[PDB]
Structure formats: structure tokens, C-alpha cells
Enzyme design. Structure first.
Site, PDB file in Angstrom:
ATOM      1  N   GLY A  14       0.798  -1.219   0.000  1.00 28.89           N
ATOM      2  CA  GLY A  14       0.000   0.000   0.000  1.00 28.89           C
ATOM      3  C   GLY A  14       0.830   1.268   0.000  1.00 28.89           C
ATOM      4  O   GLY A  14       2.067   1.208   0.002  1.00 28.89           O
ATOM      5  N   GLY A  16       4.605   8.202   1.923  1.00 27.71           N
ATOM      6  CA  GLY A  16       4.758   6.906   2.572  1.00 27.71           C
ATOM      7  C   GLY A  16       4.344   5.712   1.728  1.00 27.71           C
ATOM      8  O   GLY A  16       3.495   5.839   0.836  1.00 27.71           O
ATOM      9  N   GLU A  17       4.951   4.534   2.016  1.00 22.42           N
ATOM     10  CA  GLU A  17       4.687   3.254   1.336  1.00 22.42           C
ATOM     11  C   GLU A  17       4.812   2.069   2.303  1.00 22.42           C
ATOM     12  O   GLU A  17       5.628   2.109   3.224  1.00 22.42           O
ATOM     13  CB  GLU A  17       5.630   3.049   0.140  1.00 22.42           C
ATOM     14  N   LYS A  33       6.387  -0.156   7.039  1.00 21.75           N
ATOM     15  CA  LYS A  33       5.842   1.161   6.711  1.00 21.75           C
ATOM     16  C   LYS A  33       7.024   2.138   6.658  1.00 21.75           C
ATOM     17  O   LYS A  33       7.721   2.311   7.664  1.00 21.75           O
ATOM     18  CB  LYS A  33       4.764   1.578   7.736  1.00 21.75           C
ATOM     19  CG  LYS A  33       3.963   2.809   7.346  1.00 21.75           C
ATOM     20  CD  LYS A  33       2.919   3.118   8.404  1.00 21.75           C
ATOM     21  CE  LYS A  33       2.055   4.275   7.999  1.00 21.75           C
ATOM     22  NZ  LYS A  33       0.803   4.335   8.792  1.00 21.75           N
ATOM     23  N   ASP A 115     -10.048   6.827  12.307  1.00 23.53           N
ATOM     24  CA  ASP A 115     -10.139   6.607  10.868  1.00 23.53           C
ATOM     25  C   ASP A 115     -10.507   5.155  10.554  1.00 23.53           C
ATOM     26  O   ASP A 115      -9.891   4.520   9.699  1.00 23.53           O
ATOM     27  CB  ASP A 115      -8.861   7.039  10.116  1.00 23.53           C
ATOM     28  CG  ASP A 115      -9.100   7.374   8.642  1.00 23.53           C
ATOM     29  OD1 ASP A 115     -10.265   7.671   8.275  1.00 23.53           O
ATOM     30  OD2 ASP A 115      -8.125   7.353   7.861  1.00 23.53           O
TER      31      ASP A 115
END
Ligand code: H5K
Length: 265
Positions: A14, A16-17, A33, A115
Site C-alpha cells: 500500500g 509513505g509506502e 511502513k 479513521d
């Protein structure tokens, strides 16, 4: 043991990566991350629960932070939701049970995720749900004293209406609301509204109890009765998690356990 600390980055998970990392010796898979972040590390160090993504550690290489987190081979709950259909009701009830256990845990140690959405709910190899990404998370209870929140955080289709109408609000009913939007997505395969405001026609229709409209017409009366109690505009009147656990559908037998191998005669 030599080379036990070496990990190979094998693929993107996904953005940042987030990368899938495999140990050179043991072949253990972890998610890395590669990066608010100081708070994400500090909150992640407090966490230990079977429905919360595990934190293994971190490393700082100059300006870059590396977060070593749990690999969940089943991916995101998002990809288990068929657009406009959802998923079988017994699967949604099981995912919702595990979501509740994870949120109960977090609220219990005074942490609000802020979130909750299907992109942030990961599944392990056995399809066990794990609450992911504590980048927007904060401490709402310290030394047994509650702190009211005021910051605008989350994703508009999942945010509680008080976050848009009020200057201050309690943290727990906000996570309860987003769990209710996740439950709606799992049972209907669609989001009911863009945002929970009076200017939003879909939100007005729900407050007017027009449940003959989409997505509510696709949802059985028993889980819909639960959604009627979660998606309550006033956060003081909204159902708490202890009472979600007493809801009729929440406690309705629907699903068999994980398929277990068997022979006959
Ligand atoms: N923040 C954060 C975070 C993000 N990902 C974490 N773990 C993890 O395993 N991530 C993902 C993300 C997407 C994935 C997508 C797939 C897939 O599409 O097949 C499979 C596995 C996946 C695994 C853990 N923490």
C-alpha cells in the site's frame, strides 16, 4: 545466529509506502511502513491485542522512519465487499464481532483510532480482522480523565456528524459511528452518504427513516435495527459498545466455525 536481522523487501502492499518484508533466515513475513509519526510509534508501543495490527519495532535511518508491523495475508476488508452487493450476512457479523473486540480494547486503554474504514481493517490467513494504521490515532483518556476532542480527523463518508457540527465531542461515539458505516458497507456494498450533513440528501432521507431507499432496502431488518441505534445524530443518545453486544442481531446465530477437515463411514 548470523543474518537473522536481514529482511528482503519483496513487494508493495500500500501507499509513505507499505512493503512486504521476508526474513532471509526464518522466512517470517512482516509489513514495513516507510515514512504524527512520533505519536504513531508511541501509540503502537502501547498496543497488544489479537484484533489490532502487531507492532514489532522501528528504525530511523536519517530522515526515514521504518515501522515493522504485522503482515496480514488476507489483505483489506475493502476487497471482501462486492460493490453494490456487500458480503454474506454471517461473514459481516463475524467481521463486526472482531471489529468490536478491537475497538473495546483500544477504548479500554484510552486510545481512539479516528479513521475506521474497510481500507484500515486487515485480514490474516484465517480471515481474522485487525485494526490497522494508528497515524490519526490519539489518547482521549489519561490518568482516568477524559479529554474531549476538537480536531477534524478521518474520512468524510465515515465521520460522525458531531465532528462537522460541534467544536468539541467525545472520542468513543465517533469510532462507534464509523463502525456502523463499515457495517453498512459490508451489508450493502455501498456508502450511504458523502458526509453526515443536512446539505446531504441521503443523510436527510435516513433521518426521515426512508429505509425503502438504497442502501437500507438491501439490509435485513435485524442488522438494520442495529444500524438505527448506531447511526443516531446525537452522540449522547447513540448506542455504546456494551449495548451493541446486547443487540438482537449481534447475538443472532448465523455462522458455522472455520471449516474443519473430516472423513465419513
Ligand atoms: N499502517 C499500517 C499497516 C499497513 N499494513 C499492514 N500490514 C499488511 O500486511 N498490509 C497489507 C496491505 C494490503 C494488502 C493487500 C493484499 C492483496 O491485495 O492481496 C494482501 C496483503 C496486504 C497486506 C500493517 N500496518
Amino acid at each position: 545466529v548470523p543474518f537473522v536481522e536481514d529482511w528482503d523487501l519483496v513487494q508493495t502492499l500500500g501507499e509513505g509506502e507499505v512493503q512486504l518484508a521476508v526474513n532471509r533466515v526464518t522466512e517470517e513475513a512482516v509489513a514495513v511502513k516507510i515514512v504524527n509519526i512520533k505519536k504513531e510509534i508511541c501509540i503502537n508501543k502501547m498496543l497488544n491485542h489479537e484484533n489490532v495490527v502487531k507492532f514489532y519495532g522501528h528504525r530511523r535511518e536519517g530522515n526515514i522512519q521504518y515501522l515493522f508491523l504485522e503482515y496480514c495475508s488476507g489483505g483489506e476488508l475493502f476487497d471482501r465487499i462486492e460493490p453494490d452487493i456487500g458480503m454474506p450476512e454471517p461473514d459481516a457479523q463475524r467481521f463486526f464481532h472482531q471489529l468490536m473486540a478491537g475497538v473495546v480494547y483500544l477504548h479500554g486503554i484510552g486510545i481512539t483510532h479516528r479513521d475506521i474504514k474497510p481500507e484500515n481493517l486487515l485480514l490474516d490467513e484465517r480471515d481474522n480482522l485487525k485494526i490497522s494504521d494508528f497515524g490519526l490515532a490519539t489518547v482521549f483518556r489519561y490518568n482516568n480523565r477524559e479529554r474531549l476532542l476538537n480536531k477534524m480527523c478521518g474520512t468524510l463518508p465515515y465521520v460522525a456528524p458531531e465532528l462537522l457540527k460541534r467544536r468539541e465531542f467525545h472520542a468513543e461515539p465517533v469510532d462507534v459511528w464509523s463502525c456502523g458505516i463499515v457495517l453498512t458497507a459490508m451489508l450493502a456494498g455501498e456508502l450511504p452518504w458523502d458526509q453526515p450533513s443536512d446539505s446531504c440528501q441521503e443523510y436527510s432521507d435516513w433521518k426521515e427513516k426512508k429505509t425503502y431507499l438504497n442502501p437500507w432496502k438491501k439490509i435485513d431488518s435485524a442488522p438494520l435495527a442495529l444500524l438505527h441505534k448506531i447511526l443516531v445524530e446525537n452522540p449522547s443518545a447513540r448506542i455504546t459498545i456494551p449495548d451493541i453486544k446486547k443487540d438482537r442481531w449481534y447475538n443472532k446465530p448465523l455462522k458455522k466455525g472455520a471449516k474443519r477437515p473430516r472423513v465419513t463411514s
